[PDB]
Amino acid sequence: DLELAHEKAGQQLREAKAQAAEIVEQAKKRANQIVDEARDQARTEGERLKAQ
Amino acid sequence: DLELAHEKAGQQLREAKAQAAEIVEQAKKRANQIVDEARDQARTEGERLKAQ
Amino acid sequence: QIGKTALAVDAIINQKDSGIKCVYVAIGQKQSTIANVVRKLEENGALANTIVVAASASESAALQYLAPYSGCTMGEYFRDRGEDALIVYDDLSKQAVAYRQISLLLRRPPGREAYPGDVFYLHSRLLERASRVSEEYVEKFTNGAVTGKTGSLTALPIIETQAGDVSAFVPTNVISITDGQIFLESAMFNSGIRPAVNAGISVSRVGGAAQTKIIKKLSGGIRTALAQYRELAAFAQFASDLDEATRKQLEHGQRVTELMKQKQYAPMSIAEMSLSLYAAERGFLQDVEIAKVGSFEQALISYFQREHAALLAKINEKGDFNDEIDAGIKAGIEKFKATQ
Amino acid sequence: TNVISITDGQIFLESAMFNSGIRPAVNAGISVSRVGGAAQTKIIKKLSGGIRTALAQYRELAAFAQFASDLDEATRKQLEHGQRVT
Amino acid sequence: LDPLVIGQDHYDTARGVQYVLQRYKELKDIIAILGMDELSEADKLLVARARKIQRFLSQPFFVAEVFTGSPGKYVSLKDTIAGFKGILNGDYDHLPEQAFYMVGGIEEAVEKAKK
Amino acid sequence: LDPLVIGQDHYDTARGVQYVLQRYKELKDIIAILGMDELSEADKLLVARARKIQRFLSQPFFVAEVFTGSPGKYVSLKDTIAGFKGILNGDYDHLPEQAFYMVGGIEEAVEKAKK
Amino acid sequence: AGAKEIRSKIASIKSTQKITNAMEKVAVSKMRKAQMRMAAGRPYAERIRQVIGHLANANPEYRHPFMVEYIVVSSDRGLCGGLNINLFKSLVKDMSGYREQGAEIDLCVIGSKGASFFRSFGGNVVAAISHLGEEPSINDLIGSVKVMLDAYLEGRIDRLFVVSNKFVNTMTQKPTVEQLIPLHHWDYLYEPDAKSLLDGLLVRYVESQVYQAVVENNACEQAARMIAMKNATDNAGELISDLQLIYNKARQAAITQEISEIVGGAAAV
Ligand SMILES: Nc1ncnc2c1ncn2[C@@H]1O[C@H](COP(=O)(O)OP(=O)(O)OP(=O)(O)O)[C@@H](O)[C@H]1O
Ligand SMILES: [Mg+2]
């Protein structure tokens, strides 16, 4: 029973660590959207002014 | 020894809950940092109003 | 095609906050390649601190021959007035080809590969101007308007070899004039070591005098240790299991080899390079897998940037080092590995 | 090339032999005298025949000096004689 | 470099070092293709001494402190002769190869092996 | 061939293919003298993938039909990345080396292996 | 670059070719040492077989468990011309056959190359010995042989075999599998009881067959090493010949280029 309890402790640490990696990867994925949407808006306004 | 094994299992179980909470807490703290740096990059990328 | 321009352009980009003025001289390049370098300087915010001198592939051989001297003269303006400047000659081998054309058309007798007799003096007359001048020279040049300040011009000439052949006349001349060289290797570049610097062949003749206190102490002997690791890795490749001294040297050399890898347009400050050097030379990477060294470095830097920002700001003031900073870095790396 | 073709013979000295302690450094495997035995006294002409044979045997067997314990006795005899003549 | 100009002890030490390094030059290419284990018991020992001799030729100079980081060492003629004779006779076969790299006289090599 | 132009998936697949082919080129002289059986268990697996990558790079063209008889193939960028990524990951370690030669897309290598 | 680098590669490959030529004769010498050791151990095994035959026929009162219904030999070193690969290829055929029958398999390992094979594919090894000299001693085999004999007495093994190479001739090594455990007018004066004697002699017989299999595999190894070093010597010769042709091309081109520069410079002066 104590060996199974030790295995359960290790299992939840591996699960939490796997979710931690996924949380950070979703943040990296989100950062690229924030930066590229700013680029397209800024370049579009630059063309708006250039045509005028 | 059986009574002591149940007390030890009670410590190993709660320590694993605490460590798993801290692992996810640090991941959420890292995710918040990534999005804030992405907001400052997107805000600085606005140089195009003058650099172009 | 192995990153010679990428290394020199990233070195120019890193000076935007250093107080060093920059000059980029393009000799015999196509105009669209020059325009792309200028776009990359502007996107990274480095163009406002750089002078770009262009002598493209369609221009007269006289303009291509004179461009390095014109750029040198623009850099010397800062040196003579107690200021610091940096100059990049993207291809001295193309300047030598332009000089060879003019000389053959003037009917001057040829040398070792149809090159003029004075092709050594072409480059030595250019490269001896890049120098550091004393306070007395600046005070005399400015008629006392600037005092107590030295001036300098640093140069980063580029040379192209054919299939690694250094015995060619022009490469032989330039390696014998500069204060050091950085050799880029195609086999290392194809093997994914992208900065591709051969540590055994590359050397700096100024050494530790050109480094801040923290990098000077944390990098002492790394170059020669990597040079000996490359030999050890080849000698012990097919032999049976060796002693602890051999395993310790081999396992450390593999980690420093993976650590020296960096991406383009991503420079590191004194504090970021210092944390990376400290974690390797103080033994903290011994438990880390080779395939995880890049992830460990990126996470360690990001953690010190959030939880130890005041220490990084102290290291970045002058690159100073003492027992307080050493213990501060130690405590932070231990807490990082024990909790993240 | 010109002088090798004009002369009656050549004595070749080698850097690898000179660094291996063989002081005169004469590579006897490629050195030659076209006059040969006509330029020798009766005693040296008679004794030199077995010595040329020993150095020739040593040049053919030299790779086995590190593994001499695994050689056939008749081959070991040529090798040990070749080493002493060398 | 003549016994009639210097002495037989110096000359024998110099030729001894040269002999060991010359033999190692042909074995370097052998070890790289077929491995160290295929060499003879005498060759394996000689290769180890050659790699140690090759390192004991090194010395940090006072004018090179800016490149090396370590301090500079001056070594004498007798000290040089004694150190190389010790490696040739086998008095240091037990010391590790890295102990002879950048260490002035022979004493410091015995001390570096302990660090 | 830049992450900012073609995206990380294409860039890493291309870099992975070049790393495998470069390491195979370094072993050519050892393999020529001693054969493949002397290599490490890691090098043996890499050489097997290098041989498959080298064959999967081949392609029958619509202008080359007169030379051999085989019909031409047009392969999209999506199919190209998927095939080489699978060979690098080891998803095709069981298929024979000749199944990759002259087949256009990666699915045709699976059908060619059935013969 | 030019002729200088090619000349260095030729000397390097030539230095290697000289030792692989010597190593072929060293392998032949060691092959003869192994062949004499194979013959020296035969009288003991044939005589133990002759005793057990009479001592079992004459005593129908007792049947030993070994009279009613794998040990793998491999080398510890490199330069084997397919010796170990041809043996494992032949073994896998019989192990697959035992799984078509649905039977479980126990494996024993002699030599370092055998241990690495099963470790790379997940094979269950019950016992293992390694790093034996080129001239092995029977006292080292006792351990590995006993574990396999006990598994038979415990009813865990129905049949036991020794997997090794046989010396057909100096140019042919054959991979084989041989069964170990399952095998006239006067009688002996048995000092101890005949049952006690049969139990000891059957054990000595199986150990002797394993020792003979190990010594014959070592003779096959030296014969395989001779062929491998002969092939290495011949392969290096082809590389030297190709580099010499490339060197001569560079030699002729350097002379032509130097003459072109001298004529070009003297036309200008
Ligand atoms: N640190 C790096 N990490 C990844 N890729 C890199 C790195 N440095 C350079 N590269 C890439 O490798 C190539 C190097 O091209 P670069 O123009 O800098 O080389 P070059 O030697 O100057 O080439 P050329 O001879 O055409 O002038 C480019 O594709 C570049 O993006
Ligand atoms: Mg370039």
DSSP states of chain F = --HHHH-HHHHHHHHHHHHHHHHHHHHHHHHHHH-GGGS-HHHHHHHHHHHHHHHHT----SSSHHHH-PPP----HHHHHHHHHHHHHTTTTTS-GGGSTT-SSHHHHHHHTT-
Q: Which of G82, G120, G236 sits opposite F33 (nearest CB)?
A: G236
Q: At what angle do helices E41-56 and E77-89 cross, to 10 degrees?
A: 160
Q: In chain G, what residues touch E30 (CB-CB under 8 Å)?
A: 15-16, 19
Number of Cβ pairs < 8 A linking chain C and chain G? 20
Chain G residues closer than 8 Å to F37 by CB: 82, 85
Is the CB of residue B17 less than 8 Å away from at least one CB of chain A?
yes
Contact C42 B51 (CB under 8 A): yes
Alpha-carbon distance of C122 to C96, in angstroms, equals: 8
C1 lines ligand 1 (CB under 6 A): yes
Q: Is C191 on the interface with F (CB under 8 A)?
A: yes
Strand partners, G128: G109
d(CA F15, CA F3): 11
Q: How far apart are CA E22 and CA D15, in angstroms?
A: 10
Instruction: Using a CB–CB cutoff of 8 Å, tell me whether D64 touches chain G.
Output: yes
Kindly report each contact of residues F100-108 with a partner whose C-beta sits within 8 Å and lies 24 or more positions away, as own/partner.
F100/F52, F100/F55, F100/F56, F100/F58, F101/F55, F101/F58, F102/F58, F102/F59, F102/F60, F102/F70, F103/F56, F103/F73, F104/F59, F104/F60, F104/F73, F104/F74, F104/F75, F105/F73, F105/F75, F105/F79, F106/F56, F106/F79, F106/F82
**Residue F4 Cβ contacting ligand 1 at under 6 Å:** no
Range list of H helices, chain E? 8-34, 41-56, 65-68, 77-89, 106-112
Nearest CA in chain B to A3: B9
Which of A13, A27, A37 faces B31 most closely, judged by CB atoms? A27
What's the burial of D70, exposed, middle or buried (CB within 10 Å: 0-12/13-18/19+)?
middle
Decide if C113 and G2 are in contact by the 8 Å CB cutoff. no
Euclidean distance between CA atoms D78 and D55, whole angstroms: 10
F42 near F6, Cβ under 8 Å? no
Residue with tokens 């370049």: A43
3-state DSSP assignment of residue C85:
strand
Q: Which one-letter DSSP state was computed for residue E48?
A: H
Q: Is C266 helix (H, G, I), strand (E, B) or coil?
A: coil
DSSP letters of G145-185?
Answer: HHHHHHHHHTTS-S--EEEEEEEEETTEEEEEEEE-S----
Closest by alpha carbon to G107, among G61, G160, G68? G160
Binding residues of C: 1-5
Distance C3 CA to ligand 2 centre (A): 7
Q: Is the CB of C190 under 6 A from ligand 1?
A: no
Q: G–C contact (≥3 CB pairs within 8 Å)?
A: yes
In terms of residues, how long is chain D? 86
Interacting residues of D30 by C-beta distance below 8 A, sequence separation 6+: D10, D12
In a 3-state reduction of DSSP, which class is residue G125?
strand
How far apart are the C-alpha atoms of C114 and C100, rounded to whole Å? Answer: 7
The H or E element spanning position D33 is strand D32-33
Q: What are φ and ψ of residue C83, in 5° steps?
A: -125, 165
Chains B and F contact (Cβ–Cβ under 8 Å for 3 or more pairs): no
Q: Which two tokens stand for residue C149?
A: 């300040």
Closest by Cα among A25, C164, C1 to F2: C1
Q: What is the DSSP letter of C16?
A: T
D22 min Cα distance to partner chain E (Å): 10
Phi, psi values for residue G248, rounded to 5°? -60, -35
Please tell me the distance in Å from C263's CA to the nearest CA on chain F: 11
Cα distances (angstroms) measured from residue G60 to each of G63, G193, G199: 7, 14, 15
- Check if the beta carbon of residue G5 is closer than 8 Å to that of residue G254: no
Q: How far apart are CA B52 and CA B44, in angstroms?
A: 14
What was the structure determination method? cryo-EM
Q: How many CB pairs under 8 A join C and F?
A: 12
Dist CA G180 CA G149 (whole Å): 10
| Nearest residue (CA) to ligand 1, atom 26 | C1
**Residue C210 alpha carbon to ligand 1 centre in Å:** 26
Amino acid at C208: G
Find chains touching chain E: ≥3 CB pairs under 8 Å. C, D, F, G
Which DSSP state fits E90? Answer: T
**With an 8 Å Cβ cutoff, are D70 and G29 in contact?**
yes
Closest CA to C192 of C9, C4, C11, C2: C2
Give C43 Cα–ligand 2 centroid separation in angstroms: 19
Residues of F in contact with E32 (CB under 8 A): none
> Would the CB atoms of F33 and G239 count as touching at under 8 Å?
yes
**Is ligand 1 within 6 A of the CB of residue C328?**
no
Residues in chain F within 8 Å Cβ distance of G82: 37
For residue C155, the CA-to-ligand 1 centroid distance in Å is 20
CA separation for the pair C251, C233 (Å, rounded)? 10
Distant-in-sequence contacts of C212-215, Cβ < 8 A, 24+ apart: C212/C270, C212/C318, C212/C319, C212/C320, C213/C318, C213/C319, C213/C320, C213/C321, C214/C270, C214/C274, C214/C315, C214/C319, C214/C320, C214/C321, C214/C325, C215/C270, C215/C273, C215/C274, C215/C277, C215/C319
Instruction: Tell me the one-letter amino acid at F14.
Output: A
Rounded distance between C-alpha atoms, residue F24 and residue F39, angstroms: 11
Distance, in Å, from the CA atom of C316 to the CA atom of E102, rounded to the nearest integer, reads: 33
Cβ neighbours for A23, distance < 8 A, ≥ 6 positions apart = B24, B27, B28, B30, B31
Angle, CA of C8, C12 and C15, to the nearest 5°: 145
How many Å apart are CA E115 and CA C228, to the nearest integer?
Answer: 19
Give every CB contact of residue C195 below 8 A, 6+ residues apart in sequence: C3, C7, C260, C261, C262
For the Cβ of C2 lying below 6 angstroms from any atom of ligand 1, the answer is yes
Sheet holding C132-133, edge to edge: C50-55, C21-27, C84-89, C151-157, C132-133
Q: Is C225 in the pocket of ligand 1 (CB under 6 A)?
A: no
Cα–Cα distance, G29 to D76 (Å, whole number):
12
User: Does C192 touch chain E if contact means CB atoms closer than 8 Å?
Assistant: no
* CB < 8 Å to E23, chain D: 20
Burial of G223 (0-12, 13-18, 19+ CB in 10 A): buried
User: How many alpha carbons fall within 13 Å on the CB side of residue F114?
Assistant: 6
How many CB atoms sit inside 10 A of residue G148's CB? 25
Q: Which residue has the tokens 């001494």?
A: E49
The full length of chain F comes to: 115
**How far is residue G177's CA from residue C37's CA, in Å, rounded to a whole number?**
71
Q: Which two tokens stand for residue G152?
A: 């038979």
Q: Does C238 touch chain E (CB under 8 A)?
A: yes
Answer whether C220 contacts ligand 1 (Cβ < 6 A): no
CA distance D26 to chain E (A): 17
Q: Does residue C319 line the site of ligand 1, with CB under 6 A?
A: no
Cβ contact, residue pair B24, A24, below 8 Å: no
Angle between helices C92-105 and C119-127 (to 10 degrees): 130
Q: Which candidate in C205, C230, C282, C306 is catalytic?
A: C205
Between positions 30 and 69 of E, the ones with CB within 8 A of F are: 33
Mutate which of C156, C264, C265 for ligand 1? The one with the most ligand atoms within 8 Å of its CB, which is C264
**Resolution of the experimental structure, in angstroms:** 2.8
Among all residues of D, which ones are annotated catalytic? 34
Instruction: Say yes or no: G265 contacts chain C, CB-CB below 8 A.
Output: yes
Residue pair G17/G240 in contact (Cβ under 8 Å)? The answer is yes
Q: E strand or H helix at G210, and its extent?
A: helix G194-268
Instruction: Specify whether the CB–CB gap between E97 and E113 falls below 8 A.
Output: no
First to last CA, chain B: 76
Compute the distance between CA of residue C97 and CA of residue C102 in angstroms, rounded to an integer. Answer: 9
CB atoms closer than 10 angstroms to residue E69: 16
Q: Which residues of D9-41 are buried (b: 16+ CB within 10 A; e: fewer)?
A: eeeeeeeebebbeeeebeebeeeeeeeeeeeee
User: How far is C33 from C9, CA to CA, in rounded Å?
Assistant: 13
Give the CA-trace dihedral at C256, C259, C264, C266, to 10 degrees: -130
Q: Output DSSP code: residue C261.
A: -
SS3 of residue C25 by DSSP: strand
Nearest CA to ligand 1 atom 9: C3
CB C120 within 8 A of CB C102: no
Task: Give the CA dihedral C287, C292, C294, C298, nearest 10 degrees.
Answer: -80
Largest CA distance in chain B: 76
Tokens encoding G126: 């019950």
Q: Is E54 strand, coil or helix?
A: helix
What is the H or E stretch that residue C24 is in?
strand C21-27
> Which residues sit opposite D32 in a β-bridge?
D10
Q: Which atom of ligand 1 is nearest to the CA of C91?
A: 27
Q: Which residues have CB atoms below 5 A from the ion given as ligand 2?
A: C 4-5
Contact list in G for residue F36 (CB cut-off 8 A) is none
Whole-number Å distance, alpha carbon C4 to ligand 2 midpoint, is: 5
- The CB of C193 under 6 Å from ligand 1? The reply is no
Q: What are the CA-CA distances from residue C181 to residues C2, C93, C156, C219, C337 (Å)?
A: 16, 15, 9, 18, 37
Q: How crowded is residue C190: how many other Cβ atoms within 10 Å of its Cβ?
A: 18
C230 lines ligand 1 (CB under 6 A): no
